[PDB]
Design brief:
Two copies of one chain form a homodimer.
Chain A (H helix, E strand, L loop, with lengths): L5 E4 L5 H10 L6 E5 H17 L4 E7 L3 H14 L3 E5 L4 H11 L8 E5 L7 H4 L8 H14 L4 E3 L7 H6 L4 E4 L18 H7 L3 E4 L1 H4 L4 H11 L2
Parallel strand pairs in A: 1-2, 1-8, 2-3, 3-4, 4-5, 5-6, 6-7, 7-8
The complex binds 6-hydroxyuridine-5'-phosphate (2 copies).
Pfam family, one (chains A, B): OMPdecase
EC number (chains A, B): 4.1.1.23
GO molecular function (chains A, B): carboxy-lyase activity; orotidine-5'-phosphate decarboxylase activity
Chain lengths: ~230, ~230
């Protein structure tokens, strides 16, 4: 077990490149998050390796399918032994409930089930291209509510909602926030940003730091940095 | 190369169970579609096996992330060599365009890039739980349009839209339709259904048959059946 609310997004296009970074750090420092890129490349096999080293993995595949598929997928993750698994709230109540149930069979060994609300890389200007008149914060909340109702453990959103949410949903409903840029840090496709500091402020349970840590010379260092920074 | 517009959804929770079915059939008969369930279990390794046997694989992971992730993911698929790859239209223009571009580097060897519009397992009653006042067919079309604009090759929808679409988008914009129940066939979580026949009618380019073929004694048979049926 670690204490940092930090989950580092391992988004490398090379296994070694990534395993390099991993060896430099240690569980106690943070949790790891494998996602679409790295999973499409090394499958659950790579997840076993990261687990062999003791870390808690967050399989970030944001399942968004028909109820049947969702549930099967979630359980395949529950089989991998992962710490936490992803699902898209935009996929509907039926689907979410389906996922939840698929986990009862694993009970206490079930990973944490969380649903992605609105992606941090979006602004009302993007939701507009879709028949969306609402707004990031607004919309994300509706999804979050539906996610609550279905019995999921938490939701995924920008730290810029971690207050209105933590508010309306309580310290129970866990919040995981990505799009964490620590000042004078390139944003990129990221939008609803915030820094480690102000993030920990809103009350976020965990935060996902991607490039800031991985696209910085001597990343191991930047991690220790960001940690202390959060104390 | 095969001729059937059929892609069988390989959604088995066991590698052998699945490889059994596969050996019974042959490329010429249909194309295979690996998705969340089976991929979360056997990774791209299993995709190589299906390809080793000569079939065309459709990696159905419905990527729905931040633009950066999407593009990286898509390319990881382009590396696997898959025939066709998935992406969620609900993920926005920026994201889609990001994916498209990530493929230019592979040129002629690039898999087909298609975006999922509205999942076949949904009805206006489900879209309602979200701030959606529109309707299946309606909404799916908006997404499809945005997908067209971004330069993607096709879209994924119910065969019950393959006409208004094939209409508004032309024989160019490829259509792939799942939720195919051949009369007196259990629907399940499926909703906007249609039969192989009426599907081929609307003009769908490819169709995804899941359980009808896999949850039927002697499936190999049911495939040959459904094929002839479509002639
Ligand atoms: O809303 C979300 C949900 C995510 O999972 N993510 C993920 O967080 C990761 C890290 O992004 P970054 O390098 O910009 O910190 C990526 O894997 C991305 O897909 C995100 O950026 N926004
Ligand atoms: O809109 C969609 C998109 C899909 O990929 N699918 C997929 O098609 C597959 C087969 O479903 P079925 O067994 O009901 O024919 C599943 O892998 C499912 O996720 C779907 O059912 N509806």
């Amino acid at each position: 077990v670690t204490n940092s609310p930090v989950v580092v997004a391992l988004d490398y296009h090379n296994r070694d490149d990534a395993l390099a970074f991993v060896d430099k750090i240690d569980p106690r420092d943070c949790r790891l998050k494998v996602g679409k890129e790295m999973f499409t490349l090394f499958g659950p096999q790579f997840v076993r390796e990261l687990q062999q080293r003791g870390f808690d993995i967050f399989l970030d595949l944001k399942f968004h399918d028909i109820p049947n598929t969702a549930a099967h997928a979630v359980a395949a993750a529950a089989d991998l032994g992962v710490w936490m698994v992803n699902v898209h709230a935009s996929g509907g109540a039926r689907m979410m409930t389906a996922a939840r149930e698929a986990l009862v069979p694993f009970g206490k060994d079930a990973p944490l089930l969380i649903a992605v609300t609105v992606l941090t890389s979006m602004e009302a200007s993007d939701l507009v291209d879709l028949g969306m008149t609402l707004s990031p914060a607004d919309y994300a909340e509706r999804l979050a509510a539906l996610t609550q109702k279905c019995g999921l453990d938490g939701v995924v959103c920008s730290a810029q909602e971690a207050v209105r949410f933590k508010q309306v949903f309580g310290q129970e409903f866990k919040l995981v926030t990505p799009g964490i840029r620590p000042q004078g840090s390139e944003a990129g496709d990221q939008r609803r940003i915030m820094t480690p500091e102000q993030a920990l402020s809103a009350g976020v349970d965990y935060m996902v730091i991607g490039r800031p840590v991985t696209q910085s010379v001597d990343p191991a260092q930047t991690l220790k940095a960001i940690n202390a920074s959060l104390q």
